[PDB]
């Protein structure tokens, strides 16, 4: 059930973190779950400081919710920013300092591929509104794996790429013209970027629109509020249909409707 996004829900709260190292983050789920993996296991990177290597696994919401980590996995390599992803089994993160992006197999704790996205900048050359070294954003939507960047030639406008999840070769690339250091951050649903105006107003909008099956920009107006005034990650998941966002220590969720 595909559509244009017309509705964005109320934020629920799903976990608070309790010390500064989780002021800004990443938390997500695997919309094509494998063994031994299922659709309730979530991943929780707290992600403020230099040498980002821990994430949190828990196999059941609950002990998301509530609990202990069932399992931690240590990195190999230091992460950088929120804007990684789970995918069919694997983490897809940013090396720190790096225009790198790595495929890490979650059940066997292997890297399977690397790829430096060709012309990206990075470390702060275009971060999303906030800063934070957002220069690099993973999405899956319902179509598979892509990645939200810019480069020079595109002058720090929005461009994404189509990723190959298993060897992290890009198969299709669009250019847009939303500067990327004006908008908080985006996401996709369905081959449509999206944008959040603020990062910190209760009353931000999901603000531009980019039809990668058309090529047609839209400006939007829909209501996006950011509970907590630091809204530092915000994607999609197809198979729940919601947004997971990480704001100002807060694990949020948001339902929406499209047509
Ligand atoms: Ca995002
Ligand atoms: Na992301």
């Given at each position: 059930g595909c559509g244009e996004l017309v509705w964005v829900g109320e934020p629920l709260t799903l976990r608070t973190a309790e010390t500064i190292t989780g002021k800004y983050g990443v938390w997500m789920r695997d919309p094509k779950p494998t063994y031994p993996y299922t659709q309730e296991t979530t991943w929780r990177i707290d992600t403020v400081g230099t040498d980002v290597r821990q994430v949190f696994e828990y196999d059941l919401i609950s002990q998301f919710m509530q609990g202990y980590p069932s399992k931690v996995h240590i990195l190999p390599r230091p992460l950088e920013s929120t804007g990684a992803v789970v995918y069919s089994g694997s983490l897809y993160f940013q090396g720190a300092e790096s225009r790198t992006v790595i495929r890490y197999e979650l059940n066997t704790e292997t890297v399977k591929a690397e790829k430096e996205i060709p012309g990206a900048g990075y470390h702060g050359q275009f971060p999303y509104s906030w800063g934070g070294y957002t220069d690099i954003d993973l999405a899956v939507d319902e179509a598979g794996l892509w990645v939200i960047?810019?480069?020079?030639?595109?002058?720090?406008?929005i461009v994404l790429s189509k990723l190959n999840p298993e060897n992290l070769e890009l198969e299709q690339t669009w250019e847009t013209n939303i500067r990327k250091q004006s908008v908080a951050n985006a996401f996709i649903?369905?081959?449509t970027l999206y944008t959040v105006s603020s990062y910190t107003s209760a009353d931000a909008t999901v603000n531009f629109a980019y039809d990668t099956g058309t090529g047609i920009s839209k400006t939007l107006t829909i209501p996006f509020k950011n509970r907590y005034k630091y809204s530092s990650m915000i994607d999609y998941n197809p198979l729940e249909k919601k947004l997971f966002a990480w704001d100002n220590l807060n694990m949020v969720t948001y339902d929406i409707k499209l047509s």
């Open positions: 960047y810019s480069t020079d030639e595109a002058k720090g406008a649903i369905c081959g």
